[PDB]
A paper describes a structure:
As our solution biophysical data indicated that usGFP displayed significant dimerisation, we sought to design a variant of usGFP that remains monomeric. A point mutation at this interface was introduced to generate a monomeric ultra-stable GFP (muGFP) variant. The crystal structure of muGFP was solved at 1.8 Å resolution and contained two molecules in the asymmetric unit. The crystallographic interface between these two molecules was altered in muGFP compared with usGFP, and generation of symmetry mates within the lattice failed to provide any crystal contacts that resembled the usGFP dimer interface. This suggested that the F223D mutation sufficiently disrupted the dimeric interface observed in usGFP. Examination of L69 in muGFP showed that this residue had a similar orientation to L69 of usGFP. Importantly, the water molecule observed near Q69 in sfGFP was also absent in muGFP. Y164 of muGFP also showed an altered rotamer with respect to Y164 of usGFP, and did not form hydrogen bonds with K166 and D180, but rather, a hydrogen bond was formed between K166 and D180. muGFP Y182 formed a hydrogen bond with K162, which was not observed in usGFP. The absence of concentration dependent increase in the weight average sedimentation coefficient indicates the absence of self-association of muGFP in this concentration range and suggests that the F223D mutation was sufficient to prevent dimer formation. Critically, introduction of the single mutation F223D to disrupt the dimer had no effect on the fluorescence characteristics of muGFP, and only a slight effect on the stability of muGFP with respect to usGFP.
Residue numbers in the entry: 1 to 64, 68 to 234
The structure:
Amino acid sequence: SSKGEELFTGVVPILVELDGDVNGHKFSVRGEGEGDATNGKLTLKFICTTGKLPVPWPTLVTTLVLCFSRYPDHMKRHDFFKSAMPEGYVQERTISFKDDGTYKTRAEVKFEGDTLVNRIELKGIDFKEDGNILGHKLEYNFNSHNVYITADKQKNGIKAYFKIRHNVEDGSVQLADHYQQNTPIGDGPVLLPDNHYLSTQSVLSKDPNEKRDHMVLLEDVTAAGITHGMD
Ligand SMILES: [Cl-]
């Protein structure tokens, strides 16, 4: 157990702030809600504060707080994300969309007061203007995934590897290959994990009285051991 884990005991407010620029189409997203790490549960509504989101909402789910993952008792000694709190961690990804562009993201995840804040910069390049992403051809849904986590001893953080398959409106799938690196912001000790999985489940919806372009997300995330965590 870490000291940082103690910050997660009950329900914690979350603020997510994302500035994006994909093929020169700029946007901002703000997320508001709460996290319950005991149960591995997140409740968030995200609004595009610049008006129309120029990419599909499902392509931003992974970018838009793994510190709310439920680590079973016997895996708590492997929970990097909470151990890095309150000072927090940097999270970087390259997300490669098969036969289309790439997103590069850099986020800082830390507490500000009693709120957990995820502040992200996203830059996408090499997208097709007519493709599945800039052409909004993806279905509004998000399937369950398995994130593979490994220690990065030299950086005293973690790497993660996973694939997201987004359903396309014509019945095809759009792959998005995720490469991820996390490093702590503070100088204090953290917990480095053995290899494991995070098992994820996500429900996307709309708030019927919300006029702005938005996404309501319910997410469940639980850590799982190495033998069966792939499915
Ligand atoms: Cl969408």
